């Protein structure tokens, strides 16, 4: 079976064709514009191929409750045209094959869970740190989907007492995303994050904030592997700060090697690199195919 | 089938006999002392009855990984004799019937999930606020058990800027438990919490801290019902503060009635009152019985 994947982002769309084992056969990308024109490009790209199912990993928040009238829509976004657009249903109507749906970060979690750092485990957490901060979690082999999908980027961690930055988040100001996203780093220090790579205090601070968030996730969810991706995490030096800070914050409370001596194999970059998300959309496609047949 | 339950606490043990539908037939309690003598009382109480299975809901942290060599032990505690005592195995050796094991707060979650405020849902979160703070979560109808059971009481929420109290927690100082447990309230204000019922600012502050914790849990786990029990939550006025503060902290980020207009039916006291835990131990017993037969 050939499967289609759509990783829908605020800035670009990535579409791919691939197989259930996560092999990417072909891909394309294009800028995100209004939904009708953007989706028409998707349909035109897939028109070349004979696909059995598609999966969509979308920027959110989204309505990921399959029982909901608004399932398969983006529920909050400043991007023009996208909130409440019938994203999933338009792709189902055009393509006439099964279509899976999830957040983009859920897709990345599935990619690492099946083919990456969590292969063989029954739990993991994938976090991206880029334009925003978001996370997807697998619990007992299934994506975590409660009242909502998680919005773990918006938790309120403690400000560093020397950090004077007010925060980037339009909703909360200095939530984790507001303090530690790519744009927050840029707004705080006055240059883009990639151009601050030689300024240690930038990454100390970023590592401190990420470590505070991870301690909360460890105490609440206790995932068996934590995978950190996104633009900001291309600054690999951040990991060393995280590994120093997490044990200080937890202060020996939970006696596991993952959280102390072997933390460097617990909190890791994605095995699939920057492709975890798009590969995960193929998993969503395969799931949707199997569910239709059942 | 008659089932036995053991709710093991730091101060007292509660033992009960009951049925799979959560009916309590009989109960006894006694102070927690050293483990051999305490467990001998358990065995002597159950000796009267013909039981098919037992469930243990223990104060933790515990090792709740069934594949672990140290499964069914308490892994951290200042109480003399308890850390690493073979609690589960001693009860299995003496009783010679199936024995279930979990944290005490996991038991309370099961009680409310089957017989209480979450009956009919597939997700919930039970939090106790007493001598410590702890929580158990049900996800897709099963207790959440990752690398560890959750230790949600120890997350680091933001101090109120006018609160000068250093915090009660021996590990973290001013983690949620350190700021908002019963003993923290007493140490901060100089009287026991029950004797401060007429001092509004005590409960404003407590509501503010609990609300901050709940916002984090909502963003990370997104449970479909939040149940708040424990000694401190006998001060029912705390709920009204929580209902005012949660929406301010979230600032309309997640559009669900549970988090706004209908928050008073989302964050609730236990339907089972102070018996959620002991009833939950009967559910652990029934589970252990069924698992043996399978
Ligand atoms: N190599 C890098 N090092 C540090 N920051 C980066 C790097 N690449 C991108 N960024 C920053 O990360 C953010 C973009 O995140 P990214 O994961 O690339 O995309 P998006 O989150 O929009 O899908 C921007 O703030 C950008 O400046
Ligand atoms: N009715 C009450 N109102 C406020 N605080 C209470 C009340 N009862 C007990 N407390 C406080 O809660 C803590 C005890 O918690 P509780 O849930 O009764 O027991 P435990 O956590 O030890 O099982 C103590 O700090 C106690 O002073
Ligand atoms: Zn935010
Ligand atoms: Zn603590």
Swiss-Prot record, chains A, B:
Catalytic activity: D-fructose + ATP = D-fructose 6-phosphate + ADP + H(+)
InterPro entries recorded: ATPase_NBD, Carb_Metab_Reg_Kinase/Isom, ROK, ROK_cs
Sites where the protein binds ATP: 131, 183, 231-235
Pfam families (UniProt xref): ROK
Superkingdom as given in the UniProt entry: Bacteria
Induction (UniProt): Up-regulated by konjac glucomannan and by cellobiose and mannobiose, the possible degradation products of glucomannan. Repressed by glucose via the carbon catabolite repression system. Also repressed by GmuR.
Keywords, comma-separated and alphabetical: ATP-binding, Carbohydrate metabolism, Kinase, Magnesium, Metal-binding, Nucleotide-binding, Polysaccharide degradation, Transferase, Zinc
Cofactor dependency: Mg(2+)
Residues that hold Zn(2+) according to the record: 154, 169, 172, 175
Annotated GO MF terms: ATP binding; fructokinase activity; metal ion binding
Enzyme Commission number(s) of this protein: 2.7.1.4
CDD domains: ASKHA_NBD_ROK_BsFRK-like (cd24067)
Activity regulation note: Inhibited by zinc ions.
Biological processes per GO annotation: polysaccharide catabolic process
Role: Seems to be involved in the degradation of glucomannan.
Family: Belongs to the ROK (NagC/XylR) family.
Protein name: Putative fructokinase
Gene that produces this protein: gmuE
């Amino acid at each position: 079976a050939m499967l289609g994947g759509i990783e829908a982002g605020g800035t670009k769309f990535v579409c791919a064709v691939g197989r259930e084992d996560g092999t990417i056969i072909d891909r394309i990308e294009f800028p995100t514009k209004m939904p009708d024109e953007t989706i028409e490009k998707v349909i035109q790209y897939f028109s070349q191929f004979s696909l059995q199912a598609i999966g969509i990993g979308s920027f959110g928040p989204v309505d990921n409750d399959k029982t909901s009238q608004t399932y398969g829509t983006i529920t909050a976004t400043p991007k023009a045209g996208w909130r409440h657009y019938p994203f999933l249903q338009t792709v189902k109507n055009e393509m006439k094959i099964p279509v899976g749906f999830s957040t983009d970060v859920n897709a990345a979690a599935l990619g690492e869970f099946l083919f990456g750092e969590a292969k063989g485990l029954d739990s993991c957490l994938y976090i991206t740190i880029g334009t925003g901060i978001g996370a997807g979690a697998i619990v007992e082999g299934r994506l975590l989907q409660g009242l909502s999908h998680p919005e773990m980027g918006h938790i309120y961690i403690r400000r560093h007492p020397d950090d004077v930055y007010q925060g980037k988040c339009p909703y909360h100001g200095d939530c984790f995303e507001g303090l530690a996203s790519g744009p927050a780093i840029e707004a705080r220090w006055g240059k883009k994050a990639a151009d601050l790579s030689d300024i240690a205090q930038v990454w100390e601070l970023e590592g401190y904030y990420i470590a505070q968030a991870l301690a909360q996730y460890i105490l609440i969810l206790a995932p068996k592997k934590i995978i950190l991706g996104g633009g900001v995490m291309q600054q690999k030096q951040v990991f060393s700060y995280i590994y120093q800070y997490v044990p200080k914050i937890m202060n020996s409370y939970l006696d596991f090697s993952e959280l102390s001596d072997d933390i460097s194999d617990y909190i890791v970059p994605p095995r699939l690199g920057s492709n975890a998300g798009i590969i995960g959309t193929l998993v969503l496609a395969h799931q949707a195919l199997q569910a239709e047949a059942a």
